[PDB]
């Protein structure tokens, strides 16, 4: 249940306010508040404080860019208490070495790429350039072009100097290096005509397409011979600097983020003209820790913890879960939704109460349960490895707390799952075909089945009745929560509406089981009449015109609970069909391909599990969120959560 979450203020002097803010950020267990309006200043800190905050923020940004260029990620840790210029000096040398190494790495990589792109072509063109390197009479039209369509440009060469324009394409068969040479100006005109026919000059970047071809070939060969050892040494020194300074950079980034958060929190103060106040909210359970933080103020300049508001008008109230230790793991699934209205029904207990029960009713394969147990053992070994779960193509990065909550929820699911699977009597499907552990009157091998579930002639109406009873009970609980919350907020609209919907649902179930159900409608005719009268009376007392559409929608939400029994029967029939096919094709078809047939059947069963069990589990939580929340509302203004002072650590 949500805590009291009292509000609190304090005041003192401004330097006292900075010290108390540093302490209450070190004791970051209270969300803040604006409290702008009356008898106080805006508490605009200082231009000097703004400059120091901008300096620390730029320091944190530089540490972030340094980790990014280092490739490392911002992991929180214990900070480094140091001076601002001193931490800047510690940052600047490693950041400078890293920035220079990164620029040198990018430049050498692009240089090696451009060298390897035209290495042998420049060398072959230079070997062809042994007769006009820088001769001041004839240009050298180079064109590393496609395959031998040399006559298409030789038409333009015939348009050029006819018994001249030495033009051939020697080698380096990735591109025919068509070299043509006639003159300077007539060769410029012929290069224009050949580009009109389609041609391009070997225009490399930097100096290779800007120096003489022999010198460009020498420089390209030198860069190609030098770039590999330089790139290896660059990667080595970069990794060495990373492994040498990442902890210092991380501690600096932590201290910088902490100081910057303290500075941003200093923007939310409430000054008192050379003196200052502050206010916010915090839970009642940390009020001793709040007092322990309050002792560090100078004479403990007085903090007042005043009580929170009532069911009317608590919107800036912080939100928290505060569940039991048994109920602590169930909060993770509830976290996908929003937060309450500070007095709403925390339905987090019913989630662990029922979702595992319906999940165990869904899947009854004890072999798949043991597979889930082994997968939980693997996940538990990952948790004991204390490494965050990183899934690349799934983009699933997980801290160990959520994984441990998932594992605890999985164990709590698997307990009732094995319970209901023993109730259904199915071990990795129907092992009672091979080893008759389940007991039927048709072929009693061992212990009897409470639910046989292969036959629906005696079990289906009972399963449907069980699903309907669980659904009507949850619907009754949700409408009761709605009416009790309407009574708690003293707004008779919602409570009378829940009463009328509950009476209409009761009369609907009564009339259904009377007319469409069995005989003997005498005990329930007045019941259906009373339900209709309750619905009409709450319609008069409500006048919302929330019509029979709303009642029929609530009725469909109630009746939708049989999908649990449906999906359980579907998965059971599929598993039994696959298991019977595998056991038959193994044993009855030969009794020799039992390894091959059992392996193929188990692989198909694993494929069916991977295709079905995710949505099978999903339908219970879908039903839970679609029923227990929706009858109780849980879609009103989403609340405001407890955002205390971070101190990321």
């Amino acid at each position: 249940m949500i805590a009291p979450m009292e509000k609190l203020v304090l005041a003192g002097p401004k330097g006292r306010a900075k010290e108390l803010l540093q302490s209450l950020q070190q004791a970051g267990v209270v969300h803040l508040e604006t409290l702008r309006p009356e008898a106080l200043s805006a508490y605009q800190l200082s231009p000097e404080e703004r400059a120091e905050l901008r300096r620390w923020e730029a320091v944190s940004a530089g540490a972030e860019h340094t980790l990014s260029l280092l490739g490392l990620e911002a992991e929180p840790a214990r900070p480094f208490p140091e001076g601002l210029e001193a931490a800047e000096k510690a940052l600047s040398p490693i950041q400078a070495h890293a920035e220079g190494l990164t620029r040198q790495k990018q430049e050498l990589e692009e240089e090696l790429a451009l060298a390897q792109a035209y290495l042998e072509p420049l060398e072959r063109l230079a070997a062809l350039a042994h007769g006009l390197d820088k001769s001041p009479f004839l240009r050298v039209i180079p064109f590393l072009l496609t395959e031998k369509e040399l006559p298409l440009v030789e038409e333009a060469l015939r348009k050029a100097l006819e018994d001249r324009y030495l033009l051939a394409h020697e080698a380096y068969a990735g591109g025919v290096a068509a070299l043509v040479v006639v003159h300077r100006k007539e060769v410029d005109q012929a290069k224009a005509a050949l580009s009109r026919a389609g041609v391009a000059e070997l225009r490399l970047p930097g100096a290779l397409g800007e120096l003489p071809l022999s010198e460009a070939a020498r420089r390209l060969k030198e860069r190609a011979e030098a770039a590999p050892r330089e790139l290896s040494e660059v990667r080595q020194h970069l990794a060495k600097l990373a492994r040498e300074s990442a902890s210092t950079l991380q501690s600096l980034w932590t201290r910088a983020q902490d100081e910057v958060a303290r500075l941003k929190a200093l923007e939310e103060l409430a000054s008192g003209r050379f003196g200052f106040a502050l206010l916010g909210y915090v839970p009642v359970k940390a009020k001793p820790k709040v007092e322990e933080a309050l002792a560090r103020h100078k004479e403990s300049v007085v903090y007042a913890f005043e009580p929170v508001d009532e069911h009317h008008e608590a919107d800036r109230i912080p939100v928290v879960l505060d569940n039991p230790p048994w109920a602590k793991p169930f909060e993770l699934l509830v976290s996908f939704l929003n937060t309450p209205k500070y007095g709403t029904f925390d339905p987090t207990p019913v989630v662990p109460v029922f979702f595992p029960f319906w999940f165990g009713m869904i899947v009854g394969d004890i072999g798949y349960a043991l597979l889930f147990y082994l997968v939980g053992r693997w996940l538990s070994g990952y948790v004991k490895r204390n490494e965050p779960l990183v899934i690349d193509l799934f983009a699933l990065k997980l801290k160990p707390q959520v994984i441990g909550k998932l594992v605890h929820i999985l164990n709590w699911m698997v307990f009732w799952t094995v319970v209901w699977g023993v109730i259904y009597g199915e071990f990795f499907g129907t092992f009672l075909e091979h080893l008759g552990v389940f007991g039927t009157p048709e072929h009693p091998g061992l212990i009897p089945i409470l639910i046989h579930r292969i036959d629906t002639a005696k079990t289906a109406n009972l399963l449907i009745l069980l699903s309907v009873a669980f659904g009507v009970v949850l619907v009754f609980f949700g409408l009761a929560l709605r009416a009790y919350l309407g009574l708690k907020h003293r707004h008779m609209a919602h409570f009378w509406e829940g009463v009328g919907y509950l009476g209409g649902l009761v009369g609907v179930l009564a009339l259904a089981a009377s007319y469409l159900g069995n005989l003997q409608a005498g005990w329930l005719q007045g019941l259906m009449y009373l339900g209709f009268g309750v619905f009409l009376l709450a319609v008069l007392m409500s006048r919302i015109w929330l019509m029979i559409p709303e009642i029929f929608t609530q009725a469909g939400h109630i009746l939708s609970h049989i999908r649990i029994y449906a999906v359980g029967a579907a998965g059971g029939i599929l598993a039994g069909l696959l298991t019977d096919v595998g056991f038959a094709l193994a044993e009855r078809l030969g009794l020799l391909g039992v390894l091959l047939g059992l392996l193929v059947a188990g692989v198909l069963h694993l494929l069916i599990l991977l295709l079905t069990t995710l949505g099978h589990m999903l339908q219970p939580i879908r039903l839970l969120w679609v029923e227990f929340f929706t009858k109780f509302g849980f879609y009103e203004e989403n609340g405001r959560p407890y955002r205390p002072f971070k101190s990321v650590r």
Binding site: L337, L516, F552, G556, L559, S560, W625, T630, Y635
Partner: protein, 49 residues
């Protein structure tokens, strides 16, 4: 057929923001009453069977 375009619009609204998932799920579950009445008539037929 009802679920297709409704869930498409709900997926678009979810891709807009994470806030409106509740109304999206409400609109998603609003169409199942046809399946509910169909299963009801099916149970009525099986009882007649």
């Amino acid at each position: 057929v009802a679920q297709a375009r409704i869930g498409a619009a709900g997926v678009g609204a979810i891709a807009e923001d994470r806030s409106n998932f509740g109304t999206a799920l409400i609109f998603l579950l609003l169409p199942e009453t046809l399946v509910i009445f169909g299963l009801l008539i099916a149970f009525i037929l099986n009882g007649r069977l």
